[PDB]
């Protein structure tokens, strides 16, 4: 017997990669105008079926954290962020002597001198802002505030159509690459995955928008799961999804409305038109929440052995952080997660109030901060909590009593919530076998 | 066994300015951090500082320290205090120790999830510095 | 946070420190006789005394990390401090003491 060089074309090889993905989504309107942050139809609606398929026998060792998909999206979704930003105000015409009253708490009633559409009147205009809006220019005293940007950082408001909320998008590869899928929700992000498939573009990715806990993002099957890196580095971000979701309809109690001015001939800036005042709150029954982190802190134990667990609330570090935070509608919240996370779990036998915010700092960048524009509405939030940024004690805590506080550790983290299941990867077509031939 | 040992000091001036480091022995100095005291004249203990291990890992105590700085080189003998401003609250015997810890230190700081271990092991003789 | 500031011949020491309050991992004291430098006898119980052979331990009271040196009769040698560094960047001291015997 005898062999020779051979090659066969095509052949399912294949290896991950530094490749770059695009979007595609179902066609919301197909006009390129279409009101949106992440896929104003400038992203292409690329088949909205993924046409998916089983690797039969198929094994594969996964890599949830040097996957190239975190950064990627975190580097793109910034950007989309900043190409819908151009294209409206910036607001050069808006750090200025800022006067305030304090009425029924912490949202402050204000008005300031501003150019009108004509560069001469010193328009006198009035807005509604949540504490957190500014700082004192110098001293404490009622005419002098500034934004809280101006500081170090320039802001921009969006039209009020480039509506932050979440549409999904599916990253799709290029041809030559693919996605690989875990296809078993019994599963952690490092090492070999049984039950796997392949689509040419991932289901539906919330651009999800978390902070500290995973909204809107999917749940698993099984047991309740458990994400990390390297979980003996107890600083470093552990995810949990759910295998039961829960629900939150935050709400701004306050009858507030867009007001508009000109800040120059072609800028419109939504100034924040008031109305009893009160703080936002949310609705998420204990129990159900109680219960389900029970389950959370057995399959942290089924880690860590049989210790009694708390979770405690994030504290310290900035607010923009340190609070549960995201959009609805197109404001913001910062909610004192405390209320869900001051909370005790033996082994044996065994709601949130909140602040709204208009400018904030997203992705915690110098420069470039957003003024949200003020939503007309009583403004409501119908969402599912799925999930948890835990942070586990740095404090090693010698075997007794070890516990963790909910984080904001990265915004790419927010993001491996559902990238997990997706491997993206290149495929070598360049099939060598020993076989035997003559050229024909 | 091993001992922990600094350079010789001086009655040094008040507003003056003085640099100690490590020439202790037994042991590859090896990155193991910096740690000394202001065991100050007739009182108990206090720190030299928040301290380093391969440099960058350290921090000054509070505020207060800022007057000084701290130092580890390519040569392992720089694991080095420098003082400057020198007040009367700088005084004391800086006896110094190993550390039971090897690694890095940061995170979302103040009362947040450092884990990064910082312990004291044996300890050896030091100068006292008065102004 | 601190111990607070005698013993008869042949009983052993057992001192206190938090001053009201204090928890977890913030645990730590070292001993010293005066001239020679201060001296380990314990960080989270696996880093231990040279010479107080096995006869020192942790406790707690619910607020307290305890010099628990219950069999140490090698007691002329009493002078101890307490240390941490848990806050922000921040290493700390408990303000120890003596106990005399004689």
């Known amino acids: 017997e005898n062999l020779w060089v051979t090659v066969y074309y095509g052949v399912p090889v294949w290896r991950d990669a530094d490749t770059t993905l695009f979007c595609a989504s179902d066609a919301k309107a197909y006009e390129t105008e279409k009101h949106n942050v992440w896929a104003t139809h400038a992203c292409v609606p690329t088949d909205p079926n993924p046409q998916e398929i089983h690797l039969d026998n198929v094994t594969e060792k996964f890599n949830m954290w040097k996957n190239n998909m975190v950064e990627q999206m975190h580097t793109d979704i910034i950007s989309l962020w900043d190409q819908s930003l151009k294209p409206c105000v910036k607001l050069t015409p808006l750090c200025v002597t800022l006067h305030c009253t304090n009425v029924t708490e912490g949202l402050k009633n204000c008005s300031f001198n501003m150019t009108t559409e004509l560069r001469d009147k010193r328009q006198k205009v009035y807005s509604l802002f949540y504490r957190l809006d500014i700082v004192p220019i110098n001293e404490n005293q009622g005419s002098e505030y500034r934004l809280i940007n101006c500081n170090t950082s320039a802001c921009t408001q969006a039209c009020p159509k480039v509506s932050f909320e979440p549409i999904p998008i599916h990253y799709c590869a290029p041809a030559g690459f693919a996605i690989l899928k875990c296809k078993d929700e019994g599963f952690n992000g490092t090492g070999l995955c049984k039950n796997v498939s392949t689509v040419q573009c991932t289901h539906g990715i919330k651009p999800v928008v978390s902070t500290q806990l995973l909204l809107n993002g999917s749940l698993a099957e099984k047991n309740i799961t458990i994400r990390s890196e390297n979980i003996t580095n107890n600083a470093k971000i552990i995810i949990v999804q759910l295998v039961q979701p829960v629900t939150i309809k935050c709400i701004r109690p306050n009858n507030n409305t867009r007001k508009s001015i000109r800040i120059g001939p072609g800028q419109a800036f939504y100034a924040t038109g008031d109305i009893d005042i009160r703080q936002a709150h949310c609705n998420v029954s204990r129990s159900r929440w109680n219960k389900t982190l029970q389950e959370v802190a057995e399959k942290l134990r089924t880690y860590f052995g049989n210790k009694t667990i708390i979770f405690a609330n994030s504290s310290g570090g900035d607010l923009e952080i340190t609070t549960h935070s995201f959009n609805c509608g197109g404001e913001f919240f910062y909610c004192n997660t405390s209320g869900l996370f001051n909370s005790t779990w033996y082994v044996n036998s065994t709601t949130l109030p909140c602040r709204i915010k208009q400018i904030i700092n997203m992705w915690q960048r110098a420069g470039q901060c957003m003024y949200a524009p003020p939503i007309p509405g009583v403004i409501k939030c119908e969402s599912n909590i799925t999930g948890l940024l835990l942070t586990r004690d740095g404090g090693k805590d010698n075997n007794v009593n070890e516990t963790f506080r909910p984080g904001g550790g990265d915004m790419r983290d927010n993001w491996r919530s559902e990238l997990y299941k997706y491997k993206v990867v290149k495929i070598e077509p360049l099939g060598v076998a020993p076989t035997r031939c003559k050229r024909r | 066994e091993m001992r922990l040992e600094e350079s010789g000091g001086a009655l040094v001036k008040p507003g003056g300015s003085l640099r100690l480091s490590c020439v202790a022995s037994?042991?590859?100095?090896?990155?193991?951090?910096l740690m000394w005291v202001r065991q100050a004249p007739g009182k108990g203990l206090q720190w030299v500082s928040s301290?380093?291990?391969?440099?960058?890992?350290?921090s000054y105590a509070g505020s207060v320290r800022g007057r000084f700085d701290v130092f580890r080189d390519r040569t392992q003998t720089s694991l080095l205090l420098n003082m400057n401003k020198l007040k009367t609250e700088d005084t004391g015997v800086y006896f110094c120790?190993?550390?039971?810890?090897?690694?890095?230190?940061?995170?979302?700081?103040?009362?947040?999830?450092?884990?990064?271990?910082?312990?004291?092991?044996?300890w050896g003789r030091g100068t006292l510095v008065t102004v | 946070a601190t111990q607070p500031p005698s013993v008869s011949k042949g009983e052993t020491a057992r001192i206190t420190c938090s001053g009201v309050?204090?928890?977890?991992?913030?645990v730590s004291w070292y001993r010293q006789r005066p001239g020679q430098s201060p001296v380990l006898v314990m960080f989270?119980?696996?880093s231990r005394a040279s010479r107080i052979p096995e006869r020192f331990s942790a406790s707690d009271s619910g607020d307290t990390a305890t010099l628990t040196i219950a069999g140490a009769q090698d007691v002329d040698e009493a002078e101890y401090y307490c240390?941490?560094?848990?806050?922000?960047?921040?290493?700390?001291f408990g303000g120890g003491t003596k106990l005399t015997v004689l």
């Open positions: 120790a190993r550390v039971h810890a090897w690694r890095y230190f940061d995170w979302v700081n103040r009362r947040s999830p450092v884990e990064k271990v910082l312990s004291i092991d044996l």
């Open positions: 037994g042991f590859k100095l090896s990155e193991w951090s």
């Open positions: 301290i380093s291990l391969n440099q960058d890992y350290i």
């Open positions: 309050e204090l928890s977890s991992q913030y």
């Open positions: 989270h119980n696996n």
């Open positions: 240390q941490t560094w848990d806050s922000k960047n921040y290493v700390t």
